[PDB]
Design a protein around this ligand. Structure first.
Ligand code: ZN
Length: 609
């Protein structure tokens, strides 16, 4: 059979396909285990199928029941980050399109790489523990046995038993709660996901959660400490959904709830279906980062509805998502803003080629992950080189309204399916068969398969970047006597996004002399800004410029939140600053127990404790 996905040890989708999962599990915070049964409805694609293989990782299997009889099964040799294949001897010979239900009784490991168990000290409310999953890319196999590959899409239902003081949520539509009949100290929460999904988008959260309704199909969920702030910050979600529907086609998932995770959450968002995960660092107070969730909204079309068939083709997901997200922001803020974000994205791509190196295989759009861990691979280039490709093609093929027609047609063509880069390109050529000679001028080999920067740079409107570059070069080339010219008026027509870009460019040339920084504070009062993107770049700029006063602000930020994008570079700069280095040690020691364990660990391994 054709091997679709080399990150999966399971029977390929050419051999058999999981159509449905019914999960019945119990969450035990004392043992940090999920225990229960996974009933998989599987469809044979072959005749004479007598055994099938599933992915597992650090699972304990108690038994496998098919039609009411325990059946033989064997776990094979672990293949490092891929885990161990689970071969199931079927009690029947399956023929093409025949179905069987396989009920696996399982328990997760407390060290499961998919499950993030938080102590009460690692939550906002400090009293209850908290659990959240992160299956992307190939961690679902560490929750339950499955064909752990985006080449297979399945529906699911679930029943989750939790301690009765807590609340479960999943990447699904809420389907009621009841007392656990087997244990009055517990509650069972029920879920249904009627749209087929790849298993990396199976998600679970258990915690002391409260909700506010902020739209006809949106509740925001969080611990009680964050939920009011969150209900305000994201109050425009429904209007972003409508814009996304206009750009990409109808929203097919029913509900679009939001979950704002605890401050210790070290990542950015996650597009779990029907329940986007959100970092609390987006809680700026003025909604200036509220548009950042347009990224996860966009995945509801590009990634969750049309899905990459393997992790080699992940750029299809991210790239189109960023393309759609920047159109949402263009609808909101104008086409000049879309070019502004697009240009800044080009800059981020430059940085990453330079960080990885213009030869590094992680600067390719299509990557061969055969012997590469995809849980590291999908983290990068797929975002901005993929976006650049689509933006270059947009400009080649007659502009945004015409290329948005392609986007909607592509969503319609491949809804509920999984595809490769060649499927995408074949459809591009088919949709634009009238412009094939134009498409034949594209250096596909360079764009899709070669590392480094793309062969051609798109045309970007420079309106908004210009005002930033002007003001940043003034400072960067200004002497001490010139400092009196700067003043508040320099910022009059600058958005928060422009403020951020200005700091991005000033930090690129870091450090600035102490007097400049002191003066910049005096006239622009960047110490006052609560926007985490702005504050992060400002405090990096201060520490890198050796200002004494920024040391406590940078420590506070680096520990008030766990986002690794912020916490790690801040701890790096504070340790690199010989003055703050010691205080940065004693701060990481005093706080690491409130931190996400991976964030205390990597910040330990950076600070060398
Ligand atoms: Zn994404």
């Amino acid at each position: 059979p054709e091997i679709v996905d080399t990150c999966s040890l399971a029977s390929p989708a050419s051999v058999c396909r999981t159509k449905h999962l019914h999960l019945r599990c119990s969450v035990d915070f004392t043992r940090r285990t999920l225990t229960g049964t996974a009933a998989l409805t599987v469809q044979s694609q072959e005749d004479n199928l007598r055994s099938l293989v599933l992915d597992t990782k650090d699972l304990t299997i108690e038994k496998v029941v098919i039609n009411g009889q325990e059946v033989k099964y064997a776990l094979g040799e672990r293949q490092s980050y891929k885990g161990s294949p689970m071969e199931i001897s079927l009690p029947i010979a399956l023929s093409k399109n025949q179905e069987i239900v396989i009920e696996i009784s399982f328990e997760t490991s407390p060290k499961s790489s998919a499950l993030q168990w938080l102590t009460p000290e690692q939550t906002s409310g400090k009293e209850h523990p908290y659990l959240f999953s992160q299956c992307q890319a190939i961690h679902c196999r560490a929750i339950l046995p499955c064909q752990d590959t985006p080449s297979v899409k399945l529906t699911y239902t679930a029943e989750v038993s939790v301690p009765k003081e807590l609340v479960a949520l999943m990447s699904a539509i809420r389907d009621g709660e009841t007392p656990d009949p087997e244990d009055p100290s517990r509650k069972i929460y029920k879920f249904i996901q009627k749209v087929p999904i790849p298993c990396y988008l199976i998600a679970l959260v258990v915690g002391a959660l409260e909700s506010r309704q902020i739209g006809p199909r949106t509740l925001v969920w969080s611990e009680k400490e964050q939920v009011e702030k969150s209900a305000y910050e994201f109050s425009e979600t429904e209007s972003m959904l409508k814009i996304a529907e206009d750009l990409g086609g109808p929203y097919v998932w029913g509900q679009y709830d939001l979950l704002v995770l605890p401050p210790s959450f070290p990542y950015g968002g996650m597009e779990n279906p029907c329940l986007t995960f959100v970092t609390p660092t987006l809680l700026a107070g003025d909604k200036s980062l509220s548009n950042v969730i347009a990224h996860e909204i966009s995945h509801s079309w590009t990634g969750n509805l049309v899905t990459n068939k393997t992790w080699d083709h992940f750029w299809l997901n991210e790239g189109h998502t960023v393309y759609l997200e920047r159109h949402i922001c263009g609808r909101l803020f104008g086409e000049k803003f879309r070019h502004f974000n697009a240009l800044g994205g080009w800059g981020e791509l430059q940085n990453s080629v330079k960080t990885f190196g213009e030869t590094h295989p992680f600067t390719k759009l299509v990557v061969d992950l055969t012997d590469i861990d995809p849980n590291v691979a999908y983290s990068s280039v797929p975002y901005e080189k993929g976006f650049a490709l689509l933006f270059y093609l947009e400009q080649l093929l007659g502009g945004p309204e015409i290329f948005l027609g392609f986007l909607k047609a592509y969503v319609e063509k491949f809804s509920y399916k999984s595809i490769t880069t060649d499927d995408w390109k074949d459809f591009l050529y088919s949709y634009f068969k009238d412009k094939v000679d134009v498409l034949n001028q594209v250096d596909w080999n360079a764009w899709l398969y070669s590392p480094g920067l793309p062969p051609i740079k798109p045309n970007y409107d420079m309106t908004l970047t210009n005002a930033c570059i002007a003001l940043s070069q003034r400072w960067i080339t200004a002497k001490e006597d010139d400092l009196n010219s700067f003043n508040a008026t320099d910022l009059k027509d600058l958005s928060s996004h422009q403020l951020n870009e200005f700091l991005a460019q000033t930090l690129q040339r870091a450090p600035l002399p102490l007097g400049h920084i002191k003066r910049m504070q005096e006239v622009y009062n960047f110490n006052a800004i609560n926007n985490s993107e702005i504050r992060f770049r400002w405090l990096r700029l201060c520490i890198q410029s050796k200002w004494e006063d920024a040391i406590p602000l940078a420590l506070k930020m680096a520990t008030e939140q766990g986002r690794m994008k912020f916490t790690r570079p801040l701890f790096k700069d504070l340790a690199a600053f010989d003055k703050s280095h010691d205080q940065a040690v004693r701060t990481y020691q005093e706080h690491k127990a409130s931190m996400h364990p991976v964030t205390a660990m990597l910040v330990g391994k950076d600070l060398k404790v």
